[PDB]
Design a protein around this ligand. Sequence first.
Ligand SMILES: Nc1nc2c(ncn2[C@@H]2O[C@H](COP(=O)(O)OP(=O)(O)CP(=O)(O)O)[C@@H](O)[C@H]2O)c(=O)[nH]1
Ligand SMILES: Nc1nc2c(ncn2[C@@H]2O[C@H](COP(=O)(O)OP(=O)(O)CP(=O)(O)O)[C@@H](O)[C@H]2O)c(=O)[nH]1
Ligand SMILES: CC1(C)C[C@@]2(C)c3ccccc3N[C@@]2(C)N1
Ligand SMILES: [Mg+2]
Ligand SMILES: [Mg+2]
Lengths: 167, 167
Amino acid sequence: MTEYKLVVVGADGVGKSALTIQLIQNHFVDEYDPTIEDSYRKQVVIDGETCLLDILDTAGQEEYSAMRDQYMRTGEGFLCVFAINNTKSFEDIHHYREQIKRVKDSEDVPMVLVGNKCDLPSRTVDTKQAQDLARSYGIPFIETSAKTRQGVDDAFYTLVREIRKHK
Amino acid sequence: MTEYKLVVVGADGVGKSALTIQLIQNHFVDEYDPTIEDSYRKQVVIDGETCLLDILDTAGQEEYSAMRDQYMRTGEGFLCVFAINNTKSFEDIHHYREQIKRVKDSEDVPMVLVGNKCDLPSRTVDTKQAQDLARSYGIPFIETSAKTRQGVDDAFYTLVREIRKHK
Ligand SMILES: Nc1nc2c(ncn2[C@@H]2O[C@H](COP(=O)(O)OP(=O)(O)CP(=O)(O)O)[C@@H](O)[C@H]2O)c(=O)[nH]1
Ligand SMILES: Nc1nc2c(ncn2[C@@H]2O[C@H](COP(=O)(O)OP(=O)(O)CP(=O)(O)O)[C@@H](O)[C@H]2O)c(=O)[nH]1
Ligand SMILES: CC1(C)C[C@@]2(C)c3ccccc3N[C@@]2(C)N1
Ligand SMILES: [Mg+2]
Ligand SMILES: [Mg+2]
């Protein structure tokens, strides 16, 4: 059985946990409980292949930034999440991308840029600006909502497809 | 900060995941999604001490029984869960306890016997029979409900106290 080690990264509050819990439990969490480090294992069928996804839900809190080194060395693909109503979270993306690139010593790391909270009317980040950043990295860009489940399966499945390309 | 490595074990369907999700997220999961292996890292205050709980939510499915050796070596304390309306899950307790004892090469492993689903009227295991088994092992016994939260904090906090009391 093909195993894929996925790591969900991004600023504190973008919805990493809500995206992961929506994917795993089909449940939206309204509460904000800052994560230290949670992991999940889930069997899924992607393009007719039975995949085992090992998902790491990481801390966005900068106090836990020392923990990044290990998971960036072991992770195969990275879901880089910002929130479309939080300008700073979009600005933080490039810091995550640069750290992943430095740890892996590569510009070809499987990654997907995710613009979460697309259900919210309070947009502050233009879809075009996010599409342009993903193009500069050569990676896919998908808008999601952990609340409605819009784009959630697509974001994770696209990341698995990126890891398969790389291998 | 004192870290406690807790492992939730028991037969397929007893409510290991619902207990863990209730403890951490304060809500009840009605769905039945069989676990492979999930982990959670949560900060809690127990008896005025800031504890880091590393909780392993394991597979009850006998197909994943080979995975036990690793988590039984790493785990410091074990929540041994049966469901009060499932006699087979109560009989399976002895097998989990024997396996933990053999892996750790000790008779004094921190453990708590948990009789879950105490909200259900369909009881098949008498409280006295479970109390007698827990006495024979020299471990605490608590009845819980992942639905109502009855005994949930007490089961996990008692296990932390067992790891701490064994120290
Ligand atoms: N409306 C809406 N709210 C969302 C969405 N995703 C997450 N949220 C909300 O944003 C808040 C933060 O979500 P959370 O999943 O904890 O974010 P996180 O990035 O994991 C936080 P940390 O880095 O500390 O672990 C929560 O209140 C949650 O309900 C979304 O797609 N839509
Ligand atoms: N009434 C009631 N139902 C419960 C309780 N705990 C779990 N359940 C129900 O039992 C079923 C199984 O719960 P779950 O937490 O998945 O059990 P599990 O032991 O983790 C299953 P696995 O070993 O395959 O991972 C679910 O339908 C869940 O809602 C409880 O305390 N009371
Ligand atoms: C591979 C490993 C043993 C280590 C871990 C922390 C991790 C790292 C990257 C991606 C997923 C994932 N999950 C964990 C729990 N499993
Ligand atoms: Mg989180
Ligand atoms: Mg489970």
